[PDB]
Amino acid sequence: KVKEIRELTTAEMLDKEKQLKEELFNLRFQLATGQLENTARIKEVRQSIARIKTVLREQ
């Protein structure tokens, strides 16, 4: 969440962004197949990346 993002460091935030991007890629593949159940997780991950990028820019 936003509080945790602010706690993290610059390098930590960048690594978290990469991890979330990979997870979003995996979710896209699972949704393309029938292997995804929690569809809302995609929007959650996208908004999480948005929060991380917003914090990065406001630093």
Range in contact with RNA (rule: CB under 7 A) among 10-18, 21-29, 31-39: 31-39
Rounded Cα distance between 30 and 2, Å, is 27
Query: Which partner from the list another protein, RNA, none does 55 bind, CB cut-off 5 to 8 Å by kind?
Result: none
Q: Which residues bind another protein (CB under 8 A)?
A: 21-22, 24-25, 28-29, 31-33
Is there binding between residue 58 and RNA (CB under 7 A)? yes
Is there binding between residue 40 and RNA (CB under 7 A)? yes
- The sign of the dihedral angle between the CA atoms of 54, 9, 23, 18 is positive
- How many other CB atoms are there within 10 angstroms of residue 29's CB atom? 10
